[PDB]
Design a protein around this ligand. Sequence first.
Ligand SMILES: Cc1cc2c(cc1C)N(C[C@H](O)[C@H](O)[C@H](O)COP(=O)(O)OP(=O)(O)OC[C@H]1O[C@@H](n3cnc4c(N)ncnc43)[C@H](O)[C@@H]1O)c1[nH]c(=O)[nH]c(=O)c1N2
Ligand SMILES: Cc1cc2c(cc1C)N(C[C@H](O)[C@H](O)[C@H](O)COP(=O)(O)OP(=O)(O)OC[C@H]1O[C@@H](n3cnc4c(N)ncnc43)[C@H](O)[C@@H]1O)c1[nH]c(=O)[nH]c(=O)c1N2
Ligand code: NA
Ligand code: NA
Lengths: 315, 315
Amino acid sequence: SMTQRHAPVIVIGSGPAGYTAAIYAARAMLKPVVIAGLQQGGQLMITTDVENYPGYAEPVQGPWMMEQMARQAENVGAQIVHDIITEVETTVRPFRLKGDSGTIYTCDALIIATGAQAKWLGLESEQTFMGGGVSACATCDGFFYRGKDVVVVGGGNTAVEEALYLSHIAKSVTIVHRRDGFRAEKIMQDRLLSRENVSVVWNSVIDEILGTEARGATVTGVRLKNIVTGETQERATHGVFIAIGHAPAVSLFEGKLKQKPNGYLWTAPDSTATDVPGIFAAGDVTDDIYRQAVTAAGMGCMAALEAERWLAAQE
Amino acid sequence: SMTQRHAPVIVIGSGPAGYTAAIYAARAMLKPVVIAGLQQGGQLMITTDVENYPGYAEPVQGPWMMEQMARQAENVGAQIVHDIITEVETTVRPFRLKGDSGTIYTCDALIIATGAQAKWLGLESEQTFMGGGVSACATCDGFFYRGKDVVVVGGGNTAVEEALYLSHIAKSVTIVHRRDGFRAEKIMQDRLLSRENVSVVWNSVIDEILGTEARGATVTGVRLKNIVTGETQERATHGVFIAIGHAPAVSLFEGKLKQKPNGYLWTAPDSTATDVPGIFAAGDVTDDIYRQAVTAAGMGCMAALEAERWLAAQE
Ligand SMILES: Cc1cc2c(cc1C)N(C[C@H](O)[C@H](O)[C@H](O)COP(=O)(O)OP(=O)(O)OC[C@H]1O[C@@H](n3cnc4c(N)ncnc43)[C@H](O)[C@@H]1O)c1[nH]c(=O)[nH]c(=O)c1N2
Ligand SMILES: Cc1cc2c(cc1C)N(C[C@H](O)[C@H](O)[C@H](O)COP(=O)(O)OP(=O)(O)OC[C@H]1O[C@@H](n3cnc4c(N)ncnc43)[C@H](O)[C@@H]1O)c1[nH]c(=O)[nH]c(=O)c1N2
Ligand code: NA
Ligand code: NA
């Protein structure tokens, strides 16, 4: 493989943040290279039903949308490279990245768009029912559960937020959490629990998600286990939302870039600037608040424009 | 017309910010109404060539894109109303808006997405050559002027920023400004003027943009006038970028919502919250930094999610 390769901008990640950064950087003649990573196209690759990305009259599949973005990025002059970054040197100029290929990449500005994957319980039945009643995004799928009974799993701020959102849409929400209480801001927790259509099953986990045969397989219930006693119980439900948190993809940057208390990369207000000039971060690796494709794309744009302005200031 | 009409969320504006807010609000079952305003579809209605909105492999026309967003918004349950808001009462609950129709609209949360139109010189030749060498957005059109000679008109921070961006792409940039010096941050101005491919014509205006007959009409030069002496001169050019600033659409909110020193609506960091709880602002009415369709759409999303969270907190 190539020993070493320089681009003015390198984007790490090929989700909507990375592709958008690449589109804008390429149109500014910064000849960007996108390092695609392990999942070219990012987390939208695992959904077949996108309805809230603005600009498509009808629902689209995630892979189809991300193919359009990839094509767009290469059409305007970005180059997509199939590699995974394994190390980043943040204290040298040009910045230096090592690929799993062995190639050393160098760049004058770096845009980090590595994402923050939803965490899952680790059940085979999560896969079986994925998109047929199992979701990790209430914003995305809540609408389909209008007047239906759903379960939310988790007990942190994410679960409280997802349950509160769903309580306004679903007929009922049952939250299942392995501890005896929420580990979330008290005002939010009180607000959620006071809703008449919300109940909680404490000290419990999902033992299995139950449903029909894959003709798709559709959720019809859950088996819960009390983790104190081991006793199980089964209940009917129409949907299960897994809300146990997200894992920002920050292992390259730990100890090198400022992080927020929860692990997400810190960026400046109304900006993608990290605490190292010339390194920008866009999308779900920094955004723990909105977590949408369009917000991720918007940040990608911001990062390219900021990178361009910064590079001009270095000349 | 109707005397009075309530929606949980009302969005003022039907550009990418307004439509995106409507899409997300409708999918949260907040039954939003969008007040379309004078230009349904917003400022993208006047461009036939969009290439940097992520998710379209090939270039699209602005009207076509904005029709897709309008259709999407109504498909997911938003309602578009053809009216213009003429007054907003920001100190009452529910918020009250008056339409030019005479209808009184009321809402529990308000999302402002009224935009900030580029200002133009007021020349007939600006219209003639629109999209054939006259532009008000270097980010949008600069790419096409790779190795070409262009003119930038203006002398504020916007003109300095647009010229600096273009100096990296175009063969040359000639800035034309009616004063003897820039009215921009000194570090930026020094950086621009030191570029070897940048020149300036001070104390002057564009008297006319010159070019070919509309077969489209294509720019080939400009006539400049010194506004001290009245003397004119003519020069060849391939493109003219009008960079005299933008006009945030804030006349409804002057004296009622916090504004930034330049007139744009103030919003909180990493947020669309204005200084009145339950009133959010998204898109170019608040964003004087990025000014793109995708950033505007991203803010629309943010406003809907924040509005939804806020409404839940009121219940
Ligand atoms: C099941 C499901 C369904 C939905 C959603 C999530 C989930 C889990 N979302 C949320 C959406 O997926 C999320 O907001 C975006 O994917 C975030 O985009 P990013 O570009 O930030 O990261 P994203 O996670 O998409 O991409 C990260 C990229 O970084 C790369 N990467 C990571 N480490 C790397 C390394 N070391 N080297 C190189 N590359 C590396 C990966 O390969 C990947 O390409 C969503 N949103 C929405 O708006 N509408 C919707 O319908 C849905 N639906
Ligand atoms: C010539 C040209 C070309 C481009 C661009 C600009 C210009 C001038 N842009 C920038 C882009 O147009 C801009 O970023 C967005 O239109 C901003 O979207 P908003 O939704 O914020 O406002 P936008 O201006 O689009 O919409 C404002 C809406 O508010 C409404 N409104 C105002 N007052 C009202 C009232 N009192 N009552 C009701 N409604 C009211 C209007 O009717 C309108 O529908 C662009 N960006 C990009 O990303 N790619 C590109 O190629 C281009 N190209
Ligand atoms: Na930030
Ligand atoms: Na803000």
